[PDB]
């Protein structure tokens, strides 16, 4: 994963 | 889904306003520091693009692995458009071809986004076709790299949607059958040279960082390393 | 000039079809003949092309080293449209993903090379397109470097009557005006691939030829030195 | 000068 994979995934 | 609406969603997914706070490693910190900005606004423009949530988290990483710095250019060109010779990069960071000195090679790079400035302006490029221009990018980028698209057809369709946006704006501009089916042509056939600034843009930013000179960030250096090259 | 008159010049000055006659040397020296070959013929297409022989010398060379890569490509992605997996390059010099081994970094430019030709099935795409494509290639090139176009726009020109005859190819190939405004852009955004397959071509014919594993032919690298890389 | 200066001066 990545930092992209969490700022995809949250709101 | 019908265009006019789309043209509204376009707007409304527009990034915020971004402000700022010279040699060559100062040079690059300030553009450095820009982009990583930037890039993390970029993540929240694309999901509010319609039918990108609804693609895999694969494929979303995707699109935006491998336009990020073309999305990147067309928006520092569009803030460009009105200012000649100058470089709009924050609203309160504003470059000239002159300054580009003091990094090797940044030089180059500068005057082809200016000449893509310039352009812009003798087209009279209108707000609605740049929101268009700029999705564009990020979906006809992933048609190769590399790495398969899982539903490849449905980035077509958001693709295919967004076409039809701006051809939709352009039946309504005041403009003619003949040079109605011809605006879309010059606006598109701008797309290849941003394309190309990329590669230029990407090798350039992997040569430095390389040599040491680039500050660490970790979203920026994700998305360089998204590229993998040598 | 009309239209349709324009579809059965760009036919006429097609060049014509040519033969041929491994390892990493092997395979580079038969590719990079089978360039140097088609180099020579792609100056008489050029030269036929209807206001290219007004334009000064200064910009007839401009335009063919701007864009002869993504011109030999988009001619070598057509002869394969209608065999997969392989690239026609000639009639008897067939190719295919596996073989690009024997050099290094090849098998990387033959999958865009092939996944653009697959894409032209799909696209079920037809030759009067694809000579207007090719002929926008020429053009659409040197707009940017670098150096600058003396009659730049006596270029667009020329550029806009390829523009119209492939809208009018378009408007009776049996598409409704739906489709067939959109047609007219999934064809344009091909050229942004094709033009960052140029940037990778370049490059990887820049590091061979400095590796000393090219042969001397004097236009292939009068066309490679025409870019001034590093 | 180069070749393409003679190949487009050519007939
Ligand atoms: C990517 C670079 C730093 C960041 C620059 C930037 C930074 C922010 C932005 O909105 C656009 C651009 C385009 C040019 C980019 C530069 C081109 C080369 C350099 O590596
Ligand atoms: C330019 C290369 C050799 C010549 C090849 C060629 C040769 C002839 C042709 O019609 C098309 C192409 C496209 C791919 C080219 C290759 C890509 C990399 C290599 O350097």
Redesign the pocket.
């Known amino acids: 994963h990545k930092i992209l994979h969490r700022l995809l995934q949250d709101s | 889904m019908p265009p006019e609406q789309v043209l509204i969603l376009l707007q409304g997914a527009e990034p915020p306003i971004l402000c700022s706070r010279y040699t060559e490693v100062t040079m ?1 910190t300030l ?2 520091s ?2 990583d900005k ?1 890039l993390v606004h970029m993540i929240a423009w694309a999901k509010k693009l319609p039918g990108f949530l609804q693609l895999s988290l694969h494929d979303q990483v995707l699109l935006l692995e491998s336009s990020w ?1 073309e999305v ?2 067309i ?2 060109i569009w803030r460009s458009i009105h200012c000649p010779g100058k470089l709009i ?1 924050a609203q309160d960071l504003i470059l000239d071809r002159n300054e580009g000195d003091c990094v090797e090679g ?1 030089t180059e ?1 500068f005057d082809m ?1 200016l000449a893509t400035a310039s352009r812009f302006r003798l087209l009279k490029l209108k707000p609605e076709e740049f929101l268009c221009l700029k999705a564009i990018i990020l979906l006809n980028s992933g048609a190769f790299s590399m790495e398969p698209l899982h539903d490849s057809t449905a980035v077509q369709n958001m693709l295919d949607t967004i076409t039809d946006a701006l051809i939709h704006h352009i039946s309504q501009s005041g403009y003619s059958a003949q040079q109605q089916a011809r605006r879309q042509a010059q606006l598109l056939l701008l797309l290849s040279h941003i394309r190309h600034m990329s590669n230029k ?1 990407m090798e ?2 992997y040569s ?1 960082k390389c040599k040491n000179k680039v500050p660490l960030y970790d979203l920026l250096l994700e998305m360089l390393d998204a590229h993998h090259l040598h």
Do not use: S
């Open positions: 690059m553009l450095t820009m982009a930037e710095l990147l250019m928006g520092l990069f940044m790079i986004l843009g350039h930013l430095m």
